Design a protein around this ligand. Structure first.
Ligand SMILES: CC(C)(NC(=O)CN1Cc2ccc(-c3nc(NC4CCOCC4)ncc3Cl)cc2C1=O)c1ccccc1
Length: 342
């Protein structure tokens, strides 16, 4: 079997001529030549079986992406694994190969207004589908937006995704959270577990701001610094928005801060289209109950050239893993991947 940078890739005979792309936590990504479809593909080797959290992330992604079918959401084309549970130490997820991602693109390229507009349209169009299946992505950020050479965009990384659960959203102040710090809505740090659709809209807002300037809007360096970056631009919450934070520790923290005025979007983004800033404002609303929803965002004047609800499809139906042992999760990954075996 082929080796890439000191790691076997047991993906043959179908997939050959491997080139390194990248790696991360307990897995590696290569491109490969698919000998059946005669195109290069992305393959990610996941070796999650020693840690229950890696098993969780793997199973969530697999179950969600096999159910989902949408042009702006990365699909799974194939899954390679050993024929038995005993022999299975790795899972290979085979996906369409994309040229780049929005994180990489933003570090090197100025985006025209038309590019920003089109990228945002695609983000929201994919997210409409996700939200219509009662699923939350929960880790939207530039590196999870894949792009091909014609700027078609696909949402990836569904390892932190959850079924929406707005009646169990409430928590205490400073509750620890997993998803990427810079894209966390203010309520995460105050009183929210991130179980409502509004958490994803906040993240899309952050992404839009980062497309406008090529810099993250709220680059917090640690948990509570994230909130203070947010409040540094949005300004002090209103009485009404404060009154919705019933937990006293969270309320009193906010009340303890000096008054801060709002930084106008058009001063932060002097070259931005004014309709883009109006939509930005609505996505980056402090109060999650007042924040724009995905279907409203699509209907906003900024996206008028693209908006077409008949061509923005929804899922055919809606969607416990948290307490399950790593070994029951291996069984479920094994079972969920059986359709790809001969
Ligand atoms: C922790 C875990 C399981 N997370 C993920 O799986 C999340 N991730 C990480 C990744 C990397 C690349 C591609 C990907 N990239 C491209 N093109 C490239 C060409 C070069 O510029 C950038 C884009 N085309 C298709 C795909 Cl699917 C997709 C993903 C994805 O969903 C993990 C497991 C293993 C390794 C790291 C983390």
């Amino acid at each position: 079997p082929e080796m890439v940078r000191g790691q076997v890739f047991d993906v043959g005979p179908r997939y050959t001529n491997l080139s390194y792309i990248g790696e991360g936590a307990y897995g590696m990504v290569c491109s490969a030549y698919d000998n059946v479809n005669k195109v290069r593909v992305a393959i990610k080797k996941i070796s999650p079986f020693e840690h229950q959290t890696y098993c969780q992330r793997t199973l969530r992604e697999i179950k969600i992406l096999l159910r989902f079918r949408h042009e702006n959401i990365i699909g799974i084309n194939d899954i390679i694994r050993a024929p038995t549970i005993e022999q299975m130490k790795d899972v290979y997820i085979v996906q369409d190969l994309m040229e780049t991602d929005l994180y990489k693109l933003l570090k090197t390229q100025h985006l025209s207004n038309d590019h920003i507009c089109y990228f945002l349209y695609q983000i929201l169009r994919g997210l409409k589908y996700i939200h219509s299946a009662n699923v939350l992505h929960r880790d939207l950020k530039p590196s999870n937006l894949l792009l091909n050479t014609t700027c078609d965009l696909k949402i990836c990384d569904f390892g932190l995704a959850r079924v929406a659960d707005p009646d169990h959203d409430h928590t205490g102040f400073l509750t620890e959270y997993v998803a990427t710090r810079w894209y966390r809505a203010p309520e995460i740090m105050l009183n929210s577990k991130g179980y409502t659709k509004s958490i994803d809209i906040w993240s899309v807002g952050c992404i839009l701001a980062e497309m406008l300037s090529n810099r993250p809007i709220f680059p917090g360096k640690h948990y509570l610094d994230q909130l203070n970056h947010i409040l540094g631009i949005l300004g002090s919450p209103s009485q009404e928005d404060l009154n919705c934070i019933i937990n006293l520790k969270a309320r009193n923290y906010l009340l303890s801060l000096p008054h801060k005025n709002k930084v106008p979007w058009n001063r932060l983004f002097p070259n931005a289209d004014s309709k883009a800033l109006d939509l930005l404002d609505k996505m980056l609303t402090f109060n999650p109950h007042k924040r724009i929803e995905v279907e409203q965002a699509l209907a906003h004047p900024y996206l008028e050239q693209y908006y077409d609800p008949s061509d923005e499809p929804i899922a055919e139906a809606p969607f416990e893993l948290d307490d399950l042992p790593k070994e029951k999760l291996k069984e479920l990954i094994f079972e969920e991947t059986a359709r790809f075996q001969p």
